[PDB]
Paper text:
Eukaryotic ribosome biogenesis is a complex, tightly regulated process that involves many ribosome biogenesis factors and spans different cellular compartments. Here, we answer these questions and reveal how the nascent 60S moves from chromatin to the late-assembly compartment in the nucleolus of Schizosaccharomyces pombe (S. pombe). In vitro, Fkbp39 binds DNA and nucleosomes but dissociates to bind nascent 60S particles and to partition them from chromatin through LLPS. This partitioning provides directionality for the nascent 60S to move into the nucleophosmin-rich GC, where its biogenesis continues.
To understand the molecular basis of the defects in 60S biogenesis caused by the absence of Fkbp39, we tagged endogenous Ytm1 and analyzed whole-cell lysates or isolated (Ytm1 pull-down) nascent 60S fractions from wild-type and fkbp39Δ cells. We analyzed the isolated Ytm1-containing nascent 60S by cryo-EM, which revealed 3 major states in both wild-type and fkbp39Δ cells—each state can be further classified into multiple substates. State 3 represents a more mature particle, with the 60S already assembled but with the biogenesis complex Ytm1-Erb1-Ppp1 still present, and there was no similar state in the Fkbp39-associated material, indicating that state 3 is a post-nucleolar particle. Notably, these 3 states look nearly identical in wild-type and mutant cells, but their distribution differed markedly.
Residue numbers in the entry:
A (entry chain j): 2 to 84
B (entry chain Y): 1 to 125
C (entry chain h): 2 to 122
D (entry chain a): 2 to 74
E (entry chain C): 53 to 260
F (entry chain L): 2 to 156
The structure:
RNA sequence: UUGACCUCAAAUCAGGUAGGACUACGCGCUGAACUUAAGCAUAUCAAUAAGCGCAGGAAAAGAAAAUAACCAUGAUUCCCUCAGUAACGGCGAGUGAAGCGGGAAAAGCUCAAAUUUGAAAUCUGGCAACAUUUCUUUUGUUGUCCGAGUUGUAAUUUCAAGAAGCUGCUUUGAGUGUAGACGAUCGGUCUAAGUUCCUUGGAACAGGACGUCAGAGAGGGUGAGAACCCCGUCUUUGGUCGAUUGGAUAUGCCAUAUAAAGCGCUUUCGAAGAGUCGAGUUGUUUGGGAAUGCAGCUCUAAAUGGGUGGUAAAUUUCAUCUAAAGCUAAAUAUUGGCGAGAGACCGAUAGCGAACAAGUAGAGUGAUCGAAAGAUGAAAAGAACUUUGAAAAGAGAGUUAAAUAGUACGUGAAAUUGCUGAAAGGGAAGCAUUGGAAAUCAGUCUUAC
RNA sequence: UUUCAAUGGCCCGUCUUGAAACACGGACCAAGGAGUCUAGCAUCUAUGCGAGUGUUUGGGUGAAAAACCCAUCCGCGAAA
RNA sequence: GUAGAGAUUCUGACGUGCAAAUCGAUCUUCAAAUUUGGGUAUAGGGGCGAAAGACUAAUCGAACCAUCUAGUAGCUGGUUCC
RNA sequence: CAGAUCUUGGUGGAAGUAGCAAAUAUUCAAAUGAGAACUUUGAAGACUGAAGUGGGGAAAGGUUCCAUGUGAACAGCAGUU
RNA sequence: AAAACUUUCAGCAACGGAUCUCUUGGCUCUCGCAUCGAUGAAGAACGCAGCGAAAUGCGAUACGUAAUGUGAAUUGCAGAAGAAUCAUCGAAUCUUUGAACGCACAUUGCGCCUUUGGGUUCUACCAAAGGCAUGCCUGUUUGAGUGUCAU
């Protein structure tokens, strides 16, 4: 039950930038990201956080490879040079 | 009436297609009718506008004005015609854009690709 | 502008001198842009950049085709030269080994195939 | 439809025809068939006698087809 | 139907009593306009609508086939009365007879010019001109919804065998062409009103 | 709390049923899809009828034993009586039901004459054109796609 | 002592494979509570949410250790019906199937248990040759070595049978071109008719005359409602020419039937899956009630044996089926992804949170939370110039159809505000009724007979 | 219409036996804002047919989510 | 007794504050069970507690976040034209 | 829709009102400028008074540093700073 | 008791953004299709244009290269001259990361292997290229065992 005069001692980060998701959610002492679960192989994901999923799901980034794959599928995955 | 189901009658889709057309598609969207002499000489009703063509304005405040097409300004769907200009307040002159459907082509800038286009569209040259 | 077809009908070493000359030209143009240059110089910057890209494309395609020729009719070839359709497509059974059958099934299909028949009215 | 119904005639009338002294409350008497022996017994006895308790013997795996016997006069 | 999660995608609980505020759910957090605002209510901005519309509403509705057939026969009988045709809005003041029956050579029409010609000698073109002159921009949000224009209904051509009559007549505004074997009440009694003007083909009339 | 006339309510709606509502707005679409697939099969399978012949069997209960319906396939006993081996019956479009049996001569005969009618009206193309082997037809010019129900209905 | 073999290790050994994401729909595991019962503990919610694992274009299921008790049916799936039924339930609240029958779709099969034993007949890999390609990117063939394998790889068999026998009819390629025809297929292309007069307008796309086209009068765009100005629309399930694919056809070549196969009769024989079935028990499940399924523990079969026949037991018959091994298209699902077409939907406080630079700005250590915000005009033609002012600006002028459109921009409501005119007023105001005063105004009339 | 004079006129909504209430809510304006849909049931009413009735599970047919047509079942009713 | 750490009284100032706990005076301690930086450990029916149900990000007789959840309502309020 | 301490947005009376009173304190001339209680220079008067209102660093911030330029907006007066 | 003031009414002007009209958006339905990743995906970070912050696009070949198609633009200015901020798309590039793979990582941190190259400089130093994760499978090679024997 102490407000002001107690916020002035707050100069010690508990989270830093995560190397996987790029967010300021990397707990230093746990060495774990609260956002994406790094360094775990799987990504932190929960069905109660439906909005959290759509904030970072497929399509929110570039999808540079998936766009190329879709173009290649439409024409049947052909290779070589047209004559 | 349209009977194909690959074509859409939606106003939303038709407006989006028109206003989101790329430069190559806008080339065909900017088409102008040929004059009577050209129509009887090429058996063609309409051709896409090209720079350097000779046209006559058929509608608007500039009706009857003639001049060479200086630039088919595709991103606004406008034609800039030589000497079709406006006197600004400061004394400079700003071009007046005319839609391609409001002009009539009176002389074509013929290339070998344009001749191929004319003979490909059921015509002759 | 450098055109790709006469770029392709030259040798690799000759294209190496052209690439190095173009890189030096781009460096000179960038120095001109920072010391104050005209729009003509600043347009040549993009033209030189694309010419460098065209040359580097020609070197790489010549290198890859040479690798393809060297590895032609080899059981094992570099991964980047192999097919890349999808990971699943590369892991699927081939049509040869999808169609492999036992002699029991070969005899059944040989002697009693699905017949072409029809019914009279 | 909707235009020849109520709530188009109660537009303006407070309480929407459910009264002021008692109102329209969610489940003031219980949900479903709750009761029948405690506080719904009057309705249940006078309008649905025989509702509670078992009568007769059970038949396990009853099948109607062996019993199929429609009658004609 | 609306999105079944429209108005509930936010997280907002009631702050309760003791805050001089209505006891509605309110958006938490800070640093935005949405924080502290209402949620989860028909009276609330960006809330859920009352009783959101569902897809499992009854759209299609059953009619007894015998009563459908009753209505079709009644509409065909209505088409046979000149007074009902005039009352419904058909310009048949000059047509030769009701029911108007034309020869089977009409079924072989290949050009719209032939069809509009035949209409002019049978004096059925007043109805077509009425349809053309009645074409208007639809009033309201309909034209925003692929309902751009409205117009009247012209003659209904009924045929038995098709060898060109459909294509020759279908571009004439307001004219509808239907097979006699599959007569539709939506076309026999447009608007629920009886007495449409029907032009019969000889084989169609014989097959009635 | 239930005070009106009528029967006591019985609505089984205490679960999350809206999650599993099934609508039929795709009923006309499925009907057209089944039509198109049926026509695609009709064109693809050649003269062969789109439906194989079926045996005439009796449903197994007192409620339905007075009727005749279509079975699954012809028994091995029926195929032997009709003179068709089980290896060729599947090839010429005669289904085989190894599970069924002929407990009565009546059921046996019923399906035997069905196979005999099918065999009499069946045109079997030679495996190699121009070389008619046993059972192969000599002329196949008149081959057509006909309906097995029309050729041999369930009586 | 060398060797063989077994077992177990190492290598940046040769070549491969696995994870992560996605998860709308699929298969599992794990697993609540709010809620209902007008309390509440069994129950209900619910075999649900959350959690976890693993897939596909579908998945799963599937060729009866299935029903039935019939004149019998005959893999699975889904639909309708059965049926709110049999049944389960403080027999309360509640819950709740299946056989049949009709339809959609249909397709069947593979091993283990057999001595090839006059012949491991089988297969990975290394090497070298050829060939082939959606493809120099793909997929094989032949030869030759090394290995794997007798602690069992092929051929043969799968219970519907079969296997060995007994003559005797019948049937037969895992092939390769090439040619042309007949189909399918993304795609490059091809497409009818006024911009004739008058009026209004800034603009004709309006109104009126006069026409034309229509297998095209869908829909857009263009300076205002355009079939004929433009894109398109119809013709089009098509001409076109460029590659693709399909099933037939013409022959060419390679193919050792020295083989293989169906069928028919056997005086015959017929191998058929074990800590599994079953039983008890304890949990958990089910409509399954004297246990419906599953699981844990204990006990553990059998050989016409073992299941099952929806009341437990012993006994005796009868049907049915053949578990403890395996594959499989179609009909079915699909709040996701991708591509389309729609609509009696919403119309900027609505519709997705987001029509806009939206999961953005901003907040929180963090998990997370999460907005506001569309509209000058046809065209910037965005106000040159003079004048006042330090400037911001004003005033003229100018642009425009319009500045009662000046970007603080369509229209511009109310609250509220200033100005003007009028009026009222001794501690509220508003209202109703009746008339006065002042302002304001219509009817009627004038005419018709 | 405005204002004046004469007479009359408490603040509306709300629960309540009783509100001007020293009972609650209401500073103001605009926009939004609450008996809906579905599975049943019951009375009543309209229509079709009637000892029958119900085409729309499907199939046919339409180039078209419509309309039209259709076999066999089945639901309810004809017996308790 | 100073710095520093505290917080007795005035029940002073302020109390829409300079401040969601501050200021003034007064006062308690001031070389050790002392004060304190950074690193590190302990996490919610848990931690930690020289013990006040204290403290655990202004949240504590069970933190915060999101979901089940539009939880339930014999209770209060509202419920729109003539 | 007049009500729900309704929702969102907008706007009033209070009101030119409460208030802008801790940390001793400023003053004169000149310059600049449209404009000076506040900017700059000089002069004077003062304070922090070495446990500083001085000179540095760590945590935290991130360009706030520096020169030049200045219609607003922000610095709760002003502003040329 | 005239003005002021207050209130009312009207006009004009403010404040405000209702209303009306619109809509490259949303929502719902139907149809069709089946295609991610160790051959490095989804995601993240930093960069890339003559003049760019974002969005969009791309990766040191950086608002793109090749190839195919179309056929003369782009456009705010400048600017040049098979154009193009064009479409398609079968060849390529694809930084630092990420299942993320030499070890790490609030450290452009710390290593090892092979080859090649550099220069006033050569046993030194430096640079470049290609490599070094774990589990499992087939095979190869090298082994270990008072495991079983033969000899
Ligand atoms: Zn992270």
């Amino acid at each position: 039950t102490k407000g002001t005069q107690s916020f002035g001692m707050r100069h010690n980060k508990s989270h830093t930038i995560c190397r996987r998701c790029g967010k300021r959610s990397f707990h230093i002492q746990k060495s774990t990201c609260a956002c994406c679960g790094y360094p775990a192989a799987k990504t932190r994901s929960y069905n109660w956080g439906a909005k959290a999923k759509r904030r970072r799901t497929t399509g929110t980034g570039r999808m540079s490879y998936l766009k190329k794959v879709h173009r290649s599928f439409k024409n049947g995955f052909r290779s070589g040079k047209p004559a | 009436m349209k009977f194909s189901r690959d074509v859409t009658s939606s106003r939303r889709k038709q407006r989006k297609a028109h206003f989101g057309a790329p430069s190559s598609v806008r080339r065909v969207l900017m088409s102008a009718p040929l004059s009577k002499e050209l129509r009887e000489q090429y058996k063609i009703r309409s051709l896409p506008v090209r720079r350097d063509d000779q046209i006559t304005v058929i509608r608007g405040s500039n009706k009857g004005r003639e001049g060479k097409i200086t630039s088919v300004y595709r991103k606004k769907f406008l034609l800039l015609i030589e000497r079709v200009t406006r006197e600004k307040a400061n004394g400079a002159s700003a071009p007046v854009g005319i839609d391609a459907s409001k002009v009539v082509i009176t002389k074509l800038h013929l290339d070998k690709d344009r001749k191929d286009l004319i003979v490909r569209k059921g015509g002759k040259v | 502008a450098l055109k790709t077809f006469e770029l392709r009908k030259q040798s690799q070493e000759n294209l190496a001198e052209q690439l190095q000359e173009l890189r030096q030209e781009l460096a000179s143009l960038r120095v001109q842009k920072i010391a104050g240059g005209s729009g003509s110089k600043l347009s040549k910057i993009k033209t030189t950049r694309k010419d460098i890209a065209r040359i580097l494309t020609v070197i790489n395609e010549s290198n890859r085709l040479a690798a393809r020729e060297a590895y032609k009719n080899k059981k094992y070839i570099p991964l980047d030269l192999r097919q890349k359709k999808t990971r699943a497509i590369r892991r699927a059974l081939t049509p040869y080994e999808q169609s492999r059958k036992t002699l029991k099934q070969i005899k059944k299909e040989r002697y009693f195939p699905l017949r072409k028949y029809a019914l009279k009215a | 439809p909707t235009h020849v119904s109520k709530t188009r005639k109660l537009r303006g009338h407070v309480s929407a025809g459910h009264g002021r002294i008692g109102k329209h409350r969610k489940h003031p008497g219980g949900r479903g068939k709750a009761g029948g022996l405690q506080h719904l017994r009057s309705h249940f006895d006078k309008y649905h006698p025989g509702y509670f308790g078992k009568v007769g013997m059970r038949r396990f795996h009853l099948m109607k087809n062996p019993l199929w016997r429609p009658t004609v006069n | 139907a609306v999105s079944e999660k429209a108005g509930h995608q936010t997280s907002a609980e009631s702050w309760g009593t003791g805050r001089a505020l209505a006891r509605i759910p309110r958006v938490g957090g800070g640093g935005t306009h949405r924080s502290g605002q209402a949620a989860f209510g028909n009276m609330c901005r960006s809330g859920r609508m009352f009783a959101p519309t569902k897809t499992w509403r009854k759209w299609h509705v059953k009619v007894n086939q015998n009563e459908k057939r009753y209505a079709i026969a009644s509409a065909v009988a209505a088409s046979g009365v000149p007074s009902l045709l005039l009352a419904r809005g058909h310009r048949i003041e000059e047509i030769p007879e009701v029911p108007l029956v034309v020869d089977d050579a009409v079924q072989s029409f290949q050009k719209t010019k032939e069809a509009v010609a035949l209409l002019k000698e049978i004096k059925a073109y007043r109805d077509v001109i009425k349809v053309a002159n009645s074409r208007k921009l639809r009033a309201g949000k309909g034209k925003l919804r692929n309902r751009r224009h409205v117009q009247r209904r012209g003659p209904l051509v009924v045929f038995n065998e098709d060898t060109g009559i459909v294509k020759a007549f279908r571009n004439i505004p307001g004219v509808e062409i239907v097979n006699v074997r599959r007569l539709n009440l939506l076309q026999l009694a447009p608007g629920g009103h009886l007495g449409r003007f029907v032009i019969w083909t000889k084989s169609a009339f014989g097959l009635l | 709390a239930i005070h009106v006339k009528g029967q006591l309510p019985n609505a089984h709606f205490h679960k999350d049923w809206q999650r599993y509502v099934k609508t039929w707005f795709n009923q006309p679409g499925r009907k057209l899809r089944r039509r198109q697939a049926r026509q695609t099969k009709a064109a693809k399978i050649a003269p062969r009828p789109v439906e194989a012949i079926r045996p005439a069997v009796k449903p197994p209960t007192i409620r339905y034993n007075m009727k005749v319906r279509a079975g699954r396939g012809f028994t091995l006993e029926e195929l032997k009586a009709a003179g068709v081996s089980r290896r060729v019956a599947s090839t010429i479009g005669i289904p085989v039901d190894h599970r069924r049996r002929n407990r009565s001569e009546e059921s046996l005969q019923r399906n035997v004459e069905r196979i005999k009618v099918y065999l009499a009206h069946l045109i079997v193309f030679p495996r190699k054109a121009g070389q008619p082997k046993k059972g192969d037809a000599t002329d196949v010019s008149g081959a057509e796609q006909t309906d097995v129900a029309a050729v041999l209905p369930i009586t």
